[PDB]
């Protein structure tokens, strides 16, 4: 009564506010439910192999167009699978790959001294990663011949380079310390460098 008369006249009490927030949130919640079916035919590339449970009609215009774009995508992605073995170049050439390493290609510049299970396990993880991402340039070597008399208490130091610009750093075991460190966590860190797009729990 009196409060709503106040409301017509004044705004001294606030009580009619904030009832639009949950309204808009629920609107968007109902809206975002059509994204599952919007791209049902626009994601899978095996739907042709999924005959008799995916076909209702074929317009042969946008769907053959989908095959065309899909095959272009496939050829573009499989023309780049050239790697998969971490390689040991020498320090003499080092200037030629710190700089002349290709523009638009990430370089995981790994430096290490073999012998500690830290460096050994890190080398194992990156070598196994090479089996998954053959589109990434891996480099392994002895830092002593890469950097003269490099402090041996600063290994293994991960370097992320492209066009001579350091984008990501992971210096020493201070960020990799522990035998509990695993495959997916390394992949997670290199994804966080901005090179890879994947998903992990933690």
């Amino acid at each position: 009564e009196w409060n709503d008369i106040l409301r017509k006249k004044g705004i001294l009490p606030p009580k009619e506010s904030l009832k639009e927030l949950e309204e808009e949130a629920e609107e968007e919640q109902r809206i975002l439910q059509q994204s599952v079916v919007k791209t049902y035919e626009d994601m899978t590339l095996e739907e042709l192999e999924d005959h008799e449970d995916e076909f209702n009609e074929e317009d042969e215009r946008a769907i053959e167009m989908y095959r065309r774009r899909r095959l272009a995508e496939w050829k573009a992605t499989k023309l780049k699978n050239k790697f998969g073995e971490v390689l040991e170049i020498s320090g003499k050439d080092y200037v030629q790959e710190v700089t002349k390493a290709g523009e638009g290609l990430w370089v995981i510049l790994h430096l290490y001294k073999q012998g500690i299970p830290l460096c050994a396990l890190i080398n194992q993880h990156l070598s196994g990663l090479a089996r998954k991402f053959p589109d990434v340039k891996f480099i392994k070597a002895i830092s002593t011949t890469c950097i003269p008399n490099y402090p041996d208490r600063n290994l293994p130091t991960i370097f992320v380079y492209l066009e001579g610009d350091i984008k990501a750093q992971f210096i020493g075991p201070l960020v990799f310390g522990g035998m509990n460190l695993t495959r997916d966590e390394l992949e997670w860190k290199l994804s966080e460098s901005g090179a890879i797009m994947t998903d992990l729990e933690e």
Binding site: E1, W2, K9
Partner: peptide, 12 residues
């Protein structure tokens, strides 16, 4: 005047 307008709509 404000008081009068309010009381005119007090509804009691």
């Amino acid at each position: 005047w404000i008081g009068g307008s309010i009381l005119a709509s007090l509804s009691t």
